[PDB]
Amino acid sequence: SWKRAFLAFGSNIGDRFKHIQMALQLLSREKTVKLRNISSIFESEPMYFKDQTPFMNGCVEVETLLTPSELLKLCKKIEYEELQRTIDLDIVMFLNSAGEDIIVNEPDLNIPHPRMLERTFVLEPLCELISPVHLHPVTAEPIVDHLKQLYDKQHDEDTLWKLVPLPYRSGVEPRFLKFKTATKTNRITVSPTYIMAIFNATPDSFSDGGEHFADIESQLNDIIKLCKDALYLHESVIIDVGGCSTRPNSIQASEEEEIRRSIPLIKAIRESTELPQDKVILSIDTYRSNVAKEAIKVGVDIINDISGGLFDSNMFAVIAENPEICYILSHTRGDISTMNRLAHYENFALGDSIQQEFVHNTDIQQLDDLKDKTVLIRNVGQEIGERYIKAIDNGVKRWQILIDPGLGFAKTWKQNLQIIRHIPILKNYSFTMNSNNSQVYVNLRNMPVLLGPSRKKFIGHITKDVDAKQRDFATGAVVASCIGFGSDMVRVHDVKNCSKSIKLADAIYKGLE
Numbered sequence: 400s401w402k403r404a405f406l407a408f409g410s411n412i413g414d415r416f417k418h419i420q421m422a423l424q425l426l427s428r429e430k431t432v433k434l435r436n437i438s439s440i441f442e443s444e445p446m447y448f449k450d451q452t453p454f455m456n457g458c459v460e461v462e463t464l465l466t467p468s469e470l471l472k473l474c475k476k477i478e479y480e481e482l483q484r485t486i487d488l489d490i491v492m493f494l495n496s497a498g499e500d501i502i503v504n505e506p507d508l509n510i511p512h513p514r515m516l517e518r519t520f521v522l523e524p525l526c527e528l529i530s531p532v533h534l535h536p537v538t539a540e541p542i543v544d545h546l547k548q549l550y551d552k553q554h555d556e557d558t559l560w561k562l563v564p565l566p567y568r569s570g571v572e573p574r575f576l577k578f579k580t581a582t583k584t585n586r587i588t589v590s591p592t593y594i595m596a597i598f599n600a601t602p603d604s605f606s607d608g609g610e611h612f613a614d615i616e617s618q619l620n621d622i623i624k625l626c627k628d629a630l631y632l633h634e635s636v637i638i639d640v641g642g643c644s645t646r647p648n649s650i651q652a653s654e655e656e657e658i659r660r661s662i663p664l665i666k667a668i669r670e671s672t673e674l675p676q677d678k679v680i681l682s683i684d685t686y687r688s689n690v691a692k693e694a695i696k697v698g699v700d701i702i703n704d705i706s707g708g709l710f711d712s713n714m715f716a717v718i719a720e721n722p723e724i725c726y727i728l729s730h731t732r733g734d735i736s737t738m739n740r741l742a743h744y745e746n747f748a749l750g751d752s753i754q755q756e757f758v759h760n761t762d763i764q765q766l767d768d769l770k771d772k773t774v775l776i777r778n779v780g781q782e783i784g785e786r787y788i789k790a791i792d793n794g795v796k797r798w799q800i801l802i803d804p805g806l807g808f809a810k811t812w813k814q815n816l817q818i819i820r821h822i823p824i825l826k827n828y829s830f831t832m833n834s835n836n837s838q839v840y841v842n843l844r845n846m847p848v849l850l851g852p853s854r855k856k857f858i859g860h861i862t863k864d865v866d867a868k869q870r871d872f873a874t875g876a877v878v879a880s881c882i883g884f885g886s887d888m889v890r891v892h893d894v895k896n897c898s899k900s901i902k903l904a905d906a907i908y909k910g911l912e
């Protein structure tokens with residue numbers, strides 16, 4: 400047979416994420432159960448008892464040979480087994496082998512879960528996994544409509560933070576990237592924008608990481624300065640260490656060379672007593688799985704892969720082995736030497752496979768003409784979606800992923816502008832797709848967006864600045880606009896100055912005053 404089920408999970412005791420992970424491990428170990436998709440991780444206000452620790456919540460989609468009743472027993476076994484060394488595992492919905500929702504109303508078991516339409520912490524992660532046309536079996540209304548209805552009440556009690564796990568550090572509490580969303584109807588990120596500082600460990604151009612190249616002591620001092628500049632106005636900073644050039648047609652450092660450039664420097668930052676370690680997050684810009692693996696060993700938090708797994712087929716396997724590492728899935732085409740030729744987006748690669756496209760949970764066939772105005776962002780969204788599907792198929796968890804539409808990567812200067820304008824569409828883009836004899840639903844809602852506009856050629860074209868070094872002021876303006884269009888993180892060169900821009904844009908657009 401193989402039936403389908405959606406289960407809600409939650410914990411508000413101790414290491415909540417470890418309780419969740421253990422429950423998912425226990426499910427997966429069953430011969431009768433197959434994990435298909437997991438939602439983002441959300442933090443929510445306790446619904447019933449406000450004096451308690453906030454809950455960590457999500458949803459998991461499984462394929463199972465078990466009957467509803469057999470599955471419920473397993474959920475109870477798991478809850479008990481976890482208590483042995485604190486986790487709730489409920490059946491939310493259960494579909495038969497034909498993909499139809501079943502209803503059970505027995506003394507012991509009620510499917511769908513009787514409380515689900517009351518709880519944003521159920522519906523939000525659930526609707527990351529089910530499409531806008533999925534109806535509630537009892538009400539016959541789309542579940543997304545029931546979600547919208549809850550948000551429409553405008554109770555801050557119903558508000559969710561999304562948490563993206565970061566690695567544990569000794570003596571430190573569990574670490575996350577955090578994103579709070581609010582509604583007004585439109586949904587908007589209202590927590591501070593993350594600043595990612597660029598650090599190039601390449602010899603490429605004297606003006607940018609050029610002179611201190613291969614000198615770890617000098618480089619570290621540069622990084623201490625960056626952190627001080629950023630932390631003046633911000634609570635956190637990400638330092639993105641890059642040992643490989645990603646500029647169109649640039650010669651590629653060897654792996655051994657990239658490792659030598661990046662890894663000792665990450666080790667040195669992480670070991671520094673001159674840095675406030677708790678406010679400093681470490682990223683490595685690499686498309687190489689082995690470099691990522693080495694970086695993880697020396698205490699990196701984020702793998703920033705401009706190819707989204709395209710350059711190394713073992714990258715996803717590395718990320719999958721490290722559930723507390725954060726992975727940036729960036730959009731590109733071809734490779735570094737050919738991408739310039741591939742900036743053409745009229746035709747849709749997976750066009751034939753696409754069954755249905757949705758913007759803000761509405762079929763775009765019914766938002767007529769929007770389709771014609773959003774060719775580029777939907778094309779980029781589908782290609783990000785395809786990378787995402789392959790990541791999930793290779794053990795990467797949705798909860799680990801940030802997305803980046805990849806400004807400048809197989810895109811012209813006019814296209815980069817259009818991508819900035821259309822971030823709100825991207826953030827609310829979803830589609831169903833035929834994939835290996837069965838249907839798959841890709842939902843970009845809640846996937847935090849990183850943009851890297853800094854010093855890019857597209858700015859220079861408009862401001863007539865030939866040299867990249869003189870594009871910092873203009874970058875300030877563009878960064879403000881990126882945030883205004885919904886960017887959750889920005890990658891920048893001029894940290895001291897862009898920090899001011901980010902803070903102002905956050906005040907203006909987010910009310911963070």
Ligand SMILES: Nc1nc2ncc(COP(=O)(O)O)nc2c(=O)[nH]1
Nearest residue numbers: 409443444445446447454456487520
């Ligand atoms: N935010 C939040 N509040 C809560 N309050 C009670 C229960 C326990 O619910 P059950 O007894 O129906 O499983 N679970 C949650 C939860 O998961 N999240």
Ligand SMILES: Nc1nc2ncc(COP(=O)(O)O)nc2c(=O)[nH]1
Nearest residue numbers: 645703705727729803805806850851
């Ligand atoms: N995630 C992400 N990573 C990147 N790495 C390098 C560059 C090229 O810029 P640089 O050569 O000035 O670092 N741009 C990006 C980007 O836009 N997004």
